[PDB]
Amino acid sequence: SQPDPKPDELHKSSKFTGLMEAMKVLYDDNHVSAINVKSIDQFLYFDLIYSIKDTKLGNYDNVRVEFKNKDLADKYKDKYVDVFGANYAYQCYDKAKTCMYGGVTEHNGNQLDKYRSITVRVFEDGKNLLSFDVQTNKKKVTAQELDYLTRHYLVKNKKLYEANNSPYETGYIKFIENENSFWYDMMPAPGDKFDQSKYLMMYNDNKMVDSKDVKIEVYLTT
């Protein structure tokens, strides 16, 4: 449904002179993952606040999901959900609280027996040289979760974002569900700055897909 990237539409990493590590921390080993949690508070009319704890490093004790509109926050307000996504900030109104976008799926009637695998084909400058699987136990899973899994594998194995500079010039991730498909630009906007919240704001739609039918294709050009 979404048209594929037009010529020169993708972001060039060479036109980005900031620190690539900023984007790297978004898809490193650390993210927000919670199972069977209900909202506890609400700051603004398009967010929800969850008592999600950082068992890893103890950084955050509360997490604030931001949505694109109000119907999403009012939707998942009183429902027990699972949370999965990339956190970016540490704010106050004790431990601090971190923020993210979307990544909320309903719990009941959404868990699978075994781990469902999704195959990811990677194309470097045109040729399919790499292909790996990403697992999930969710019938309906956010595109943010699959994107974070894919980009995480690419972080650790192919050095997609390193601390300084990037080996890859352009790159976008493509989710194809049956007939329809959409894509996301993986490279930061040009300039010396990089706003984590503005980049991650693309996830505020809470776009979900079916793990049985979705297919993932990553396209990178050096």
Numbering used by the authors: 2 to 94, 108 to 236
Q: What is written in the article reporting this PDB entry?
A:
Staphylococcal enterotoxin B (SEB) is one of seven toxins secreted by Staphylococcus aureus, and is classified as a bacterial superantigen. SEB is one of the group II superantigens, a group that includes SEC and SpeA. Superantigens in this group bind to T-cell receptors (TCRs) in a peptide-independent manner to generate an abrupt and strong immune response. This 28 kDa toxin consists of two domains, domain I (amino acids 30–120) and domain II (amino acids 127–239), which are composed of a β-barrel structure and antiparallel β-sheets, respectively.
We designed a vaccine candidate, S19, with reduced TCB–SEB interaction by introducing the following four mutations: N23A, Y90A, R110A and F177A. S19 was originally designed to make fewer molecular interactions with TCB than wild-type SEB, as a result of the removal of key interacting side chains. S19 maintained a similar overall structure to SEB, which is required for its antigenicity as a vaccine candidate. However, S19 exhibits some structural changes in its flexible-loop region. Although the entire structure of the loop region has not been determined, owing to its outwards orientation and high flexibility, the N-terminal region of this loop is well stabilized by intramolecular hydrogen bonds and by a disulfide bridge between Cys93 and Cys113. The Y90A mutation was the sole reason for the observed structural change, as depicted in Fig. 1(c). Tyr91 of S19 moved into the original position of Tyr90, which had been stabilized by hydrogen bonds to Asn60 and Asn88. The disulfide bridge in SEB was broken in S19 owing to the ∼8 Å translocation of Cys93 in S19. The interface areas between TCB and SEB and between MHC and SEB were decreased 27 or 14% by the mutations, respectively; thus, the simulation reflected the loss of binding residues. The number of simulated hydrogen bonds also decreased from 10/10 to 8/5, respectively. S19 was originally designed to have a lower binding affinity for TCB, but structural determination revealed reduced interactions with both binding partners, TCB and MHC.
